[PDB]
């Protein structure tokens, strides 16, 4: 029982993705999220590139539902914008249209790290950091956690009107009961590795600290070898880098469900000659610099002693020469390659 005139009227007027956009052979990504394409508008109103994501699966799952719900409301320069949603009734597939981002921090960092043997504009790191903090702050002010921040998700705009603006993407929209308890762990806060029951603003801020350290060194600060939340070797690396946390540095660590496992597996005295000062000194970042001091506040072990995004933006690091720019490339020529295409 659905009116026929109502049906065919809507069927006549419906915008279909395959009529509107050329994307045949232009697949640039494939993962658990689905399939992303570099799309161009067929009815040539503009010559902009768009990112076309066909969501994994069929119908409207909780993940799909919440991604649509929140992106439909969110609007900030440093958060990726949902332009339109196509619902294909025949095959039950959902498509999302976004602005196209040529680069990301995973590909940028990998290009520098690859060329270092076989951060060239001054103020690029700082500009990336400030814009990452500005975006995450907007989400957190609207009680939207990201829950999965990493260099592959921090996108950067290529040539065009938004040249060198950071675009946050791939927010963890669906997690049951806001719970991590329901493979690489390098950007995961130590409380998550110790069995924290829920995601927090602080968990996101820790991720931002790791990315920042990666931008400064070209190496993931808590790099590690490849179900339950406890991961011993991941925690071993955090301690080699940060030192083992003293009782005074994190009073509530005793309240964590995996605390007794930590005590059983680890000894404080193993990491006596270990600190963030010492790690960064080996990778040629000065421990008296404002860049280091901000990092230490972001990479604080106790979650209640980690700085928020709003305090990080206010740091005097952003008032020291060079100033952050809107264009992260500072008007300079972009030496990174474009995205390779893929097969099906």
């Amino acid at each position: 029982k659905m009116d026929y005139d109502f049906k065919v009227k809507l069927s006549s007027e419906r915008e279909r993705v395959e009529d509107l956009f050329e994307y045949e052979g232009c697949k640039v990504g494939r993962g658990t999220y689905g399939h992303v394409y570099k799309a161009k508008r067929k009815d040539g109103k503009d010559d902009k590139d768009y990112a076309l994501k066909q969501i994994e699966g069929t119908g409207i799952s909780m993940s799909a539902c919440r991604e649509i719900a929140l992106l439909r409301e969110l609007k900030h320069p440093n958060v990726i914008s949902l332009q339109k949603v196509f619902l294909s009734h025949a095959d039950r597939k959902v498509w999302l249209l976004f602005d196209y981002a040529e680069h990301d921090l995973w590909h940028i960092i990998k290009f520098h790290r690859a060329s270092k043997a076989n951060q060239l504009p001054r103020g690029m790191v700082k500009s990336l950091l400030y814009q990452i903090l500005d975006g995450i702050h907007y989400l957190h002010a609207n009680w939207v956690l990201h829950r999965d921040l990493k260099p592959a998700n921090i996108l950067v705009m290529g040539e065009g009107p938004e040249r060198g603006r950071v675009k946050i993407a791939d927010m963890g929209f669906a997690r049951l009961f806001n719970s991590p308890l329901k493979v690489t762990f390098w950007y995961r806060a130590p409380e998550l590795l110790l069995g924290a029951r829920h995601y927090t603003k602080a968990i996101d801020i820790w991720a931002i600290g790791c990315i920042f350290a990666e931008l400064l060194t070209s190496e993931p600060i808590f790099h590690c070898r490849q179900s339950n939340p406890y991961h011993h070797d991941q925690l071993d690396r955090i301690f080699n880098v940060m030192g083992f946390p003293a009782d005074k540095d994190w009073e509530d660590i005793k309240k964590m469900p995996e605390h007794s496992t930590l005590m059983k597996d680890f000894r404080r005295n193993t990491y006596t000659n270990c600190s963030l000062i010492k790690y960064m000194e080996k990778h040629k970042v000065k421990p008296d610099s404002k860049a280091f001091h901000l990092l230490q506040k972001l990479l604080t072990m106790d979650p209640i002693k980690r700085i928020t995004s709003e305090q990080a933006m206010q740091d005097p690091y952003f008032l020291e020469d060079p100033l952050p720019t809107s264009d992260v490339f500072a008007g300079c020529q972009i030496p990174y390659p474009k995205r390779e295409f893929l097969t099906e």
Binding site: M2, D3, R66, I68, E73, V85, V144, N178
Partner: protein, 266 residues
């Protein structure tokens, strides 16, 4: 909690606070079949269906309210003949449940809930059992999302009401009565025509009048257009006279037969 302070830049505010005269113009399509009176009785009836579905599924009130608003938004734009409202009601609960993050309503549990609520609580209106299977829900879901222009986040009066009664320092006395009046306002068009806080304020004022609470200077101390708050009070006071003079159970079989029917394919 998500988007709590973004109302003034939200899709709710910018697209889904409608002009009253535009709303009644699109309503004229169904007023050839139903009277204005019969049309609101239908609105009251299906607000209760969605409420009953929500209670049976053990959903919190805010989820039930998002569901009710999805249903109201659809039939504000389209005819009752376009999709059977008996199909639309559980579809609205389904979709609304999926927007919130704590738990998911399964397929068999949705269909069993619709079946059980209509048989046990609404057999005055419906002699035949719930005829739609789950694939009818899934198809209807695509049309609903599309008609709402993918607008899923809905702001309600419950949150501001709690903040206002806490501010007065009379949570114990007034909050149960005022909360129940917010529930009742979903029997009307109020959620399509006024921002949630104004509806909250009107409901608090009526709660104070019923309980003989003198909140004159507290209401004066607000900075808001009172004339609009008065407009809402009058809709709430008229709803209770509607309620009194309306026997839902005795009337709704006849009214549901006057509804324009979906034309089948020739």
């Amino acid at each position: 909690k998500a988007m709590a302070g973004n109302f003034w830049q939200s899709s709710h505010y910018l697209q889904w606070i409608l002009d009253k005269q535009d709303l009644l113009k699109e309503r004229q399509k169904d007023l050839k079949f139903l009277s204005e009176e019969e049309y609101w009785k239908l609105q009251i009836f299906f607000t209760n269906v969605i409420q009953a579905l929500g209670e049976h599924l053990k959903l919190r009130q805010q989820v039930i309210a998002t569901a009710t608003v999805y249903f109201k938004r659809f039939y504000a734009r389209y005819s009752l003949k376009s999709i059977d409202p008996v199909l639309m009601a559980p579809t609205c609960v389904f979709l609304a449940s999926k927007v919130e993050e704590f738990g998911v309503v399964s397929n068999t549990r949705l269909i069993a809930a619709a079946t059980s609520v209509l048989k046990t609580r609404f057999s005055y209106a419906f002699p035949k059992e719930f005829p739609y299977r789950m694939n009818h829900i899934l198809e209807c879901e695509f049309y609903l999302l599309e008609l709402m222009d993918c607008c899923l986040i809905v702001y309600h009066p419950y949150r501001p009401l709690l903040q206002y009664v806490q501010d007065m320092g009379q949570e114990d006395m007034l909050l149960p009565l005022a909360w129940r009046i917010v529930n009742d306002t979903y029997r009307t068009d109020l959620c399509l025509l006024y921002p949630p806080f104004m509806i909250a304020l009107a409901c608090l004022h009526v709660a104070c009048v019923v309980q003989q609470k003198d909140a004159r200077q507290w209401f004066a101390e607000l900075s808001v257009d009172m004339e609009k708050i008065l407009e809402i009070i009058r809709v709430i006071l008229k709803l209770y006279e509607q309620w009194k003079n309306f026997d839902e159970r005795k009337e709704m079989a006849t009214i549901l037969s006057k509804m324009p029917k979906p034309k089948p394919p020739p």
